Amino acid sequence: LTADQMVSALLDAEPPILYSEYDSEASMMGLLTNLADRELVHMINWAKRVPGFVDLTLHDQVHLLECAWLEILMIGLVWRSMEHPGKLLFAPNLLLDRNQGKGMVEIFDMLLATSSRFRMMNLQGEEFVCLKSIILLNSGVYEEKDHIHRVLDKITDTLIHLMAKAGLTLQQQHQRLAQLLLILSHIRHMSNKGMEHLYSMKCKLSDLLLEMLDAH
Amino acid sequence: SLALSLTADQMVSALLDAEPPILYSEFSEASMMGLLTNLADRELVHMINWAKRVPGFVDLTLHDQVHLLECAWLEILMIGLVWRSMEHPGKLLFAPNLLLDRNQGKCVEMVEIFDMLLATSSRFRMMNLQGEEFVCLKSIILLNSGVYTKDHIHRVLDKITDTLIHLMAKAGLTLQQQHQRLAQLLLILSHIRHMSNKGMEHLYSMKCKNVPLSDLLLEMLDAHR
Amino acid sequence: ILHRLLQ
Amino acid sequence: KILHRLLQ
Ligand SMILES: Cc1ccccc1/N=C(\c1ccc(O)cc1)c1ccc(O)cc1O
Ligand SMILES: Cc1ccccc1/N=C(\c1ccc(O)cc1)c1ccc(O)cc1O
Numbered sequence A: 001l002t003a004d005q006m007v008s009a010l011l012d013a014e015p016p017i018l019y020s021e022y023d024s025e026a027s028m029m030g031l032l033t034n035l036a037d038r039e040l041v042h043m044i045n046w047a048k049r050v051p052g053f054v055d056l057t058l059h060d061q062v063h064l065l066e067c068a069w070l071e072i073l074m075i076g077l078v079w080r081s082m083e084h085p086g087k088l089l090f091a092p093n094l095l096l097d098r099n100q101g102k103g104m105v106e107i108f109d110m111l112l113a114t115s116s117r118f119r120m121m122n123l124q125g126e127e128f129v130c131l132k133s134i135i136l137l138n139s140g141v142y143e144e145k146d147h148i149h150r151v152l153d154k155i156t157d158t159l160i161h162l163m164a165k166a167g168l169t170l171q172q173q174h175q176r177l178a179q180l181l182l183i184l185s186h187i188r189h190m191s192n193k194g195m196e197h198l199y200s201m202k203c204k205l206s207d208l209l210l211e212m213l214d215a216h
Numbered sequence B: 001s002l003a004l005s006l007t008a009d010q011m012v013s014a015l016l017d018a019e020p021p022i023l024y025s026e027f028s029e030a031s032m033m034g035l036l037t038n039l040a041d042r043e044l045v046h047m048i049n050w051a052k053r054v055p056g057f058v059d060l061t062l063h064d065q066v067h068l069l070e071c072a073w074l075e076i077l078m079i080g081l082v083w084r085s086m087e088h089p090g091k092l093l094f095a096p097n098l099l100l101d102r103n104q105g106k107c108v109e110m111v112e113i114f115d116m117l118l119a120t121s122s123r124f125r126m127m128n129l130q131g132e133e134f135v136c137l138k139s140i141i142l143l144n145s146g147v148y149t150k151d152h153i154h155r156v157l158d159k160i161t162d163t164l165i166h167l168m169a170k171a172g173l174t175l176q177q178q179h180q181r182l183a184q185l186l187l188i189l190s191h192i193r194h195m196s197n198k199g200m201e202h203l204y205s206m207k208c209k210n211v212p213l214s215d216l217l218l219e220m221l222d223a224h225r
Numbered sequence C: 001i002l003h004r005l006l007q
Numbered sequence D: 001k002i003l004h005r006l007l008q
Helices: A003-012 A025-047 A056-081 A103-119 A127-136 A146-166 A170-202 A207-213 B008-017 B029-051 B062-084 B111-129 B131-144 B153-171 B174-209 B215-224 C002-006 D001-008
Strands: A087-091 A094-097 B092-095 B098-100
Touching: A003 A127, A003 B092, A025 A056, A025 A087, A025 A094, A025 B029, A025 B098, A025 C002, A025 D001, A056 A087, A056 A103, A056 A170, A056 A207, A056 C002, A087 A103, A103 A127, A103 A170, A127 A146, A127 B174, A127 C002, A146 B174, A170 A207, A170 B131, A170 B153, A207 C002, B008 B029, B008 B131, B008 B153, B029 B062, B029 B092, B029 B215, B029 D001, B062 B111, B062 B174, B062 B215, B062 D001, B092 B111, B092 B174, B098 B153, B111 B174, B131 B153, B131 B174, B153 B174, B174 B215, B215 D001
Parallel strands: none
Antiparallel strands: A087 A094, B092 B098
């Protein structure tokens, strides 16, 4: 699969931006749960279109998604929130800023910071779909896992191939690559912190989300 | 800032010469966690002085220095563990005199964090991770884990990226093999972050149930709550 | 649920 | 905080 072949497949596999039911802490968080629960369905049928994913076991596919799902929702959130400085576009009709965070506030700022980092870097869509797929394949990789490593390496080739096209020098490609991949540490952090917050909410949710939680 | 006016080889040497020493230790649940807490408490002191020797770290505000360490301390302790556990497959070498298997972790409500650590060590072993790459990674963790929670830090990170590549090109790696290996190494930092977060929760669980924590160690925990 | 949806 | 003192 060519690099350009890689980007197209990923670009074409993108899920749709879903809408909220907008217009308290319970109400808002209730809305985000509703949204996340519907996004999860698209995410699942999106992962299937991610190169290599279908070649994995059904159990492995379950593991990868159980680990990465919130990471994937969050990098989706941060991406569509790029051109909206100081706000988080959870949905086209659900655009929120820091001062309605309400134990969320810490998680909000982290998401806000990630989106600022993306905008600073002028993150391209092609690069975004690359990162998101890396997350699905990487976040739970730790038999033939290493087919996953072969695919991960392919995606890395795609990232670099993209960057060379934008006129980035050899040194500029290596640095940008690290910068993108380093952001995935933070997304890992937000996800983990997010899970914890949700674990506090369970003992006050969607039936599928609950299944996704106890996996952690 | 001297860290930017530094070549790859001078960066590597600076990091290699700043390496903290390998401390020694002194099983029930409290017995095992007592030794680990004691050990961690002693390494933190060396970590703090190691950090001041990581290029660019000295230019940061004291407040910022405090923040980066508070965020990355367990990550750094863990990648240290994983590194020195490389030459001992299936084993965790917390200290030269404290080598543990997975079965020992089961005496603590811990085995899940053991396996993840052992898995990371297997990854390093599989990649034939070098010491030069290790000290680079560890400094990256220090400067990156708290940066988004500041252009100086990004420019130092880039410099370390340059160093990692410079090492790979020195070991005869092809151009494609160079950036592929970089992403592989950097992606492992996601797992170390995860292991740290899972570690923290376990320590807060330990702190509320009263092994006794160091005041310095408690000060690090409270920073993540 | 996740298994059935993958299927 | 102890970190303040140790870092100086
Ligand atoms: C903001 C947040 C805090 C804690 C846990 C998850 C969180 N994020 C969530 C989220 C997930 C599940 C909830 O019950 C509610 C929200 C989220 C939902 C959809 C989306 O596109 C992006 C998202 O980040
Ligand atoms: C294995 C583990 C499980 C849960 C939490 C921390 C853990 N690790 C620990 C650890 C740290 C602090 C504690 O109070 C106790 C232990 C650890 C200690 C020293 C070291 O060189 C590397 C380390 O990973």
